[PDB]
Amino acid sequence: AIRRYYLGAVELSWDYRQSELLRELHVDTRFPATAPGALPLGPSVLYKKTVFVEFTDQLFSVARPRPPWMGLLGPTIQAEVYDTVVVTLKNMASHPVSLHAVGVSFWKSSEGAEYEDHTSQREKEDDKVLPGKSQTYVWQVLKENGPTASDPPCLTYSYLSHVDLVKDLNSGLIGALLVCREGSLTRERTQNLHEFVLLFAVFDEGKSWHSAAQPAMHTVNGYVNRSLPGLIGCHKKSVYWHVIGMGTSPEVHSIFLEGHTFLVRHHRQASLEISPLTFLTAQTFLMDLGQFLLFCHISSHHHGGMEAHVRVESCAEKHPKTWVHYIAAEEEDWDYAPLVLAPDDRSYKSQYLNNGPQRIGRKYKKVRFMAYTDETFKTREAIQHESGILGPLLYGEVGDTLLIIFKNQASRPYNIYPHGITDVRPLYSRRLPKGVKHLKDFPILPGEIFKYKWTVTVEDGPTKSDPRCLTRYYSSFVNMERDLASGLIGPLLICYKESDKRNVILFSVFDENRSWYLTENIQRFLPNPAGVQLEDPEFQASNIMHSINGYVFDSLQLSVCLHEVAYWYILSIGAQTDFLSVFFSGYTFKHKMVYEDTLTLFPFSGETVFMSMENPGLWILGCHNSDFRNRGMTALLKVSSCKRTRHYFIAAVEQLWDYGMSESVPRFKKVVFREFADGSFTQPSYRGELNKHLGLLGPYIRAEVEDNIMVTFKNQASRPYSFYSSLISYPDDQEQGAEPRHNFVQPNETRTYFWKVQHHMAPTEDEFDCKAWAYFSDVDLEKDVHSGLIGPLLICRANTLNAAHGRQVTVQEFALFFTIFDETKSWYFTENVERNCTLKENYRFHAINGYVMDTLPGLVMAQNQRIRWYLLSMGSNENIHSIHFSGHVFSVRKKEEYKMAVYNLYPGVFETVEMLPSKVGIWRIECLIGEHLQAGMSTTFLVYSKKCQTPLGMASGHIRDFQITASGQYGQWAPKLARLHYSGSINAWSTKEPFSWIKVDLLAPMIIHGIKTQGARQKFSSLYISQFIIMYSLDGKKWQTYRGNSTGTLMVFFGNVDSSGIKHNIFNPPIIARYIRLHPTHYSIRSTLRMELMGCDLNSCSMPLGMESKAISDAQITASSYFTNMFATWSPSKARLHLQGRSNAWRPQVNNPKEWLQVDFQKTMKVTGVTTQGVKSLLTSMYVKEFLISSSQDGHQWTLFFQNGKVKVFQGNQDSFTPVVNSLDPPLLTRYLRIHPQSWVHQIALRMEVLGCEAQ
Ligand SMILES: *[C@@H]1O[C@H](CO)[C@@H](O[C@@H]2O[C@H](CO)[C@@H](O[C@@H]3O[C@H](CO[C@H]4O[C@H](CO)[C@@H](O)[C@H](O)[C@@H]4O)[C@@H](O)[C@H](O[C@H]4O[C@H](CO)[C@@H](O)[C@H](O)[C@@H]4O)[C@@H]3O)[C@H](O)[C@H]2NC(C)=O)[C@H](O)[C@H]1NC(C)=O
Ligand SMILES: *[C@@H]1O[C@H](CO)[C@@H](O[C@@H]2O[C@H](CO)[C@@H](O[C@@H]3O[C@H](CO[C@H]4O[C@H](CO)[C@@H](O)[C@H](O)[C@@H]4O)[C@@H](O)[C@H](O[C@H]4O[C@H](CO)[C@@H](O)[C@H](O)[C@@H]4O)[C@@H]3O)[C@H](O)[C@H]2NC(C)=O)[C@H](O)[C@H]1NC(C)=O
Ligand SMILES: *[C@@H]1O[C@H](CO)[C@@H](O[C@@H]2O[C@H](CO)[C@@H](O[C@@H]3O[C@H](CO)[C@@H](O)[C@H](O)[C@@H]3O)[C@H](O)[C@H]2NC(C)=O)[C@H](O)[C@H]1NC(C)=O
Ligand SMILES: [Ca+2]
Ligand SMILES: [Cu+]
Ligand SMILES: [Zn+2]
Secondary structure: OOEEEEEEEEEEEEEEOOOOOOHOOOOOOOOOOOOOOOOOOOOOOEEHHHHHEOEEEOOOEOOOOOOOOOOOOOEEEEEEEEEEEEEEEEEEOOOOOOOOOOOOOOOOOOOOOOOOOOOOHHHOOOEEOOOOOEOOOOOOOOOOOOOOOOOOEEEEEEOOOOOHHHHHOOOEEEEEEEEEOOOOOOOOOOOOOEEEEEEEEEHHHHHHOOOOOOOOEEEEEEOOOOOOOOOEEOOOOOOEEEEEEEEEOOOEEEEEEOOOOOEEEOEEEOEEEOOOOOOEEOOOOOOOOOOEEEEEEOOOOOOOOEEEEEEEEEEOOOOOOOEEEEEEEEEEEOOOOOOOOOOOOOOHHHHHHHOOOOOOOEEEEEEEEEEEEOOOOOOOOOOOOOOOOOOEEEEEOOOOOEEEEOOOOOOOOOOEEEEEOEEEOOOOOOHHHHHOOOOOOOOHHHHHEEEEEEEHHHHHHHOOOOOOEEEEEEOOOHHHHHHHHHHHOOEEEEOOOOOOOOOEEEEEEEOOOOOOOHHHHEEEEEEOOOEEEEEEEHHOOEEEEEEOOOOOOOOOOOOOOOOEEEEEEEOOOOOOOEEEEEEEEOOOOOOOOOOOOEEEEEEEEEEEEEHHHHOOOOOOEEEHHHHOOOOOOEEEOOOOOOOOOOEEEEEEEEEOOOOOOOOOOOOOOEEEEEEOOOOOOOOOOOOOOOOOOHOOOOEEEEOOOOOOEEEEEEEEEOOOOOEEEOOOOEEEEEEEOOOEEOOOEOOOOEEEEEEEOOHHHHOOOOOEEEEEEEEOEEEEEEEHHOOOOOOEEEEOOOOOOEOOOOOOOOOEEEEEEEEEEOOOOHHHHHHHOOOOOOOOOOEEEEEOOOOOOOOOOOOOOOOOOOOEEEHHHHHHHHOOOOEEEEOEEEEEEEEEEEEEOOOEOOOEEEEEEEEOOOOOOEEEEEEHHHHHHOOOOOOEEEEEEEEEEEEEOOOOOOOOOOHOOOOOOOOOOOOOHHHHOOOOOOOEEEOOOOOEEEEEEEEEEEEEEEEOOOOOOEOEOOEEEEEEEEEEEOOOOOOEOOOOOOOOOOEEEOOOOOOOOOOEEEEEEEEEEEEEEEEEEEEEEEEEOOEEEEOOOOOOOEEOOOOOOOOOOOOOOOOOOOOOOOOOOOHHHHHOOOOOOOOEEOOOOOOOOOOOOOOOOOOOEEEEEEEEOOOEOOEEEEEEEEEEEEEEEEOOEEEEEEOOOOOOOOOOOOOOOOOOOOEEEEEEEEOHHHHHEEEEEEEEOOOEEEEEEEEO
């Protein structure tokens, strides 16, 4: 279970289409006149690429054979749970490369990423491997790394070079990582399976390492235009697909397979919705021999390199209805806005819907699908308002047959064919009319009729885990683009067996600049068909109707009844190209057996959602996408009939905001939600520790289910703003009609919201203890989120949220809002003249919670301790962020529980995930969209061990006098005395000033878990601090009050009751600081203090390695000699800090500076110091005055711990009883440590502990 891999970063030439340039393996030396050149050319081009390649051995002589199909893709690495991977990378390239694995565990020596991690330079070799050199890596695959019960037998992850994502990805450094549960060795029937990693990578050769612009290749495994070789699957079997998206900007890919459906998680999906670091395991099953096009389907034919062939080949060894429809393609005049709702117009509405100089406006002639009653087509079946434009609803359960008698009646040859059903032959015959490869592209003529037999089979239908019905569609296919654009579209449900089937919602941009009838419309509808323009980009874009069903800017109003439990069948077929993030106001539909709140839809995609109309009111169905919705895509919902109360006091207030100064400061006016204490919005409930991380985000508003939520919201701020969530449930008040729920807080006004929390606002029994929902202003959805109004609304479950904290407390919880603020769109944008004197790209910030560039504070988490992450993205389509917890994996839950390593955040979606932190240290949260990352979208978190409490040296004098500092001194009662247990005379700090403080500079950032506190006696009175508060700072003039564990304005700590006693307050969101400062607030007679500071370094390596705690068996301790006589035995074994009794320490058989004491940790350890002691014996005292230190990995090679030049000589031990620490400040690794005493007193005699932690 130690899997060894020998990757190397190799450069090669690549033209993308020519397979077998990968004969690197073999000097394929071309002779004639040659048409290449590792730069460009023309007759085929040839690009500089650096990819991952495998090797036979640890000496990189012979490269592996790589398959036809892998292309650029690195070697796939596989591991079961509990194995260990040990990769050796050898860089053989122009540029440097790292190896950063996703979805396994590693040790920071192995993380292959570099950032401000407080990491020894040895643990930073991994971070960048230079040309030549090597680096072994080692990955862990722990139990929390592996798949769940519901997961595939083997999770699809990846690994890449992580030195310059934009460069590294765009140049070919990306391979597959397969983390399977234990049983990567079961005899799969290796006729099916086959299994093919499917990199869906866009490469921007105009910004790979090699480049300067140039072009950007949408590829599959690095091949363009159907050229990928080798994708063969066996016939009546099934093939798995480990799918990895890649790209260094946004962009999504809607991936299809001509005759086929994908099964993922456990759902029948038609396309694969993928986008930068999306990871899937899809499986498909092959019933039809032949060759089928795998391809991305985005209208933008540029999206049109993602096209590869799959060949499938023989290998070796009650009663179902028949539904009948008479349907006609036939032309009509179509009105996009037949409902008098004009007035609203300082907003676009005019442009798309007016007549004159060069606008058709709103009445375009189109062709539709129209249902008739019989073969005569002289009479129409029942139309129905609300589904306008879209053809007749075509239902069909698994097993049924649909007879689509089709008659044309138009002015071009059309056609009708369903995407969804595999088995669609002609009726009666099984053979096609002419040289017709496929019924799909075969047209229907004059007014001919064709008779089709669509048969719905099982493999078309749902899958237990998805809904009773699933949403498809039909359309003419003689010319998909312009036919659909002319309006040939209609809905097709496909369902399961044992006010009926209800609303169909079609999100459709009809580009009337492509509709066959563009010309016909121009003649009839223009002032002078003379004014041609056609590419006058206003006229052109004036016929790009952003439609819902067939209506726009709110003409589709649709009535439901209060508590009508209604299904919604939802499609995105149009020009479109980008995903849609669809929402209903005030409402919450059920998606994957989970209540969500926005529903993201890729092009040519359809989903079923299901909701109960519990919110009386007028609502808008719509788009959430910024600048659609503006362009018409709206629609209306008109409903109408036919234990605690957790009160939060919240206001929208303005501030300045730099999203982070540090490292490189313009400041920006924003407006944000903050919590206040009183109705009298005057006590602003300042936050810290538990909420420092909130950033630009509103406060956590938390309810359980069935209690009530009450937000009093007061608008400060210049503009009017709103508190909306979509959990906000208005009651069946105000009759007379449906009413748009007011909302809208005018400045200074103070509106109040109250609503009970329904089981449907809360976790399914299969979700986590606590669900997250967003809330924001909605007076201008787009403009005033960018301004800054946004927050998390946790809805906890059952009896989970409790205490007097109103919070889980069982689990550490954080909220992360990823988005790219455009201060050009933020209201206060003109007030941000204040700069000095033409592109905006410095007015945009890629900011987690409003901090950019590892600047977001507040992320500290205990060692082993569940952590729940609410992840939100918002905004423009660009915001498809791909969030990674480096070195960690988490679990997402929707009806079942799946392990993941990168969550693919789509705007408007608010997922909740839980992880446990394996490894202590400082770790990174990225967005692996490389552009986003390098624009700052990153931060870090700290996981600490709760078991690394140690005295920071305050009593022990390790803290030198000069670091203690106060403010007044009484006299001779100096702060250099504040040292716990100090004795005599004057023996503490003391000040007669009321307002005072004492301050300790630890000299570097540290983790503090507590403070032990005394105070002395002066003759017969007792002096002590009975009540203090703690301030801390990171730089030294950035103090913040330790509002520890929220509690109130601040944490007031209880000091002492007397001289003697120690009071051991603890910091339970521990303090990360280097200056801590204690402010006496109540003292007896005099503020007076001896104190000790409990704490730890940042990486939690301060605890002993088990010398005193016999955890280092006497066999691991060994020395060069050891004096023994008859009554003595000063054997190494005994050289343990504080050991007592006879012969209690190590003594070399003779004293000389060549002797040494040695410790074999067995494993590699991170030694960060050495405490060291001497001994009293035979009432004659011996100890080691000076020493130096050697270290080793093998036990036969050695290096002395140099420092600042010339071999460190450590102080250590002036007496035979006092232990003395000696931190190693370029901290040692190695498994071997030797102590070399140089100068002593009477006799060399050593007792010690070693300080550090485990490594490797
Ligand atoms: C995979 O798919 C198809 C094959 O089915 C090919 O797609 C087209 O290939 C042709 C060449 O065979 C391209 O035509 C020429 O492209 C030149 C490069 O400019 C491109 O790059 C920029 C980068 O931003 C694009 O924005 C731009 O639109 C171009 O696509 C042009 O210089 C050529 O311009 C012509 O018109 C100008 C204007 O007067 C003249 O000055 C020129 O001399 C020339 O006559 C020309 O357009 C075509 O662009 C490709 N289409 C697309 C969508 O890229 C792929 O090449 C094929 N193979 C791959 C991808 O490797
Ligand atoms: C405000 O300050 C308080 C204290 O001042 C903090 O409260 C406790 O803080 C820590 C974590 O920050 C917790 O203390 C202990 O947690 C340990 C976790 O180990 C258990 O965790 C797993 C979860 O996977 C359990 O399944 C398993 O039992 C592990 O042992 C344990 O040492 C203790 O947990 C268990 O102890 C007994 C078992 O005999 C049970 O009865 C307990 O209910 C619990 O299951 C121990 O609890 C603790 O979780 C915090 N809460 C407490 C003590 O109520 C706050 O966290 C802090 N507020 C913040 C940070 O917001
Ligand atoms: C809000 O508006 C007022 C100024 O118009 C300022 O606070 C308010 O100051 C007035 C001064 O007398 C106080 O009287 C009250 O005014 C409110 C209008 O907000 C009115 O409804 C009451 O009946 C009463 O006459 C008032 O106490 C005080 N407002 C509050 C809420 O205490 C202030 O400049 C403005 N800004 C904010 C943030 O309140
Ligand atoms: Ca590292
Ligand atoms: Cu991102
Ligand atoms: Zn694409």
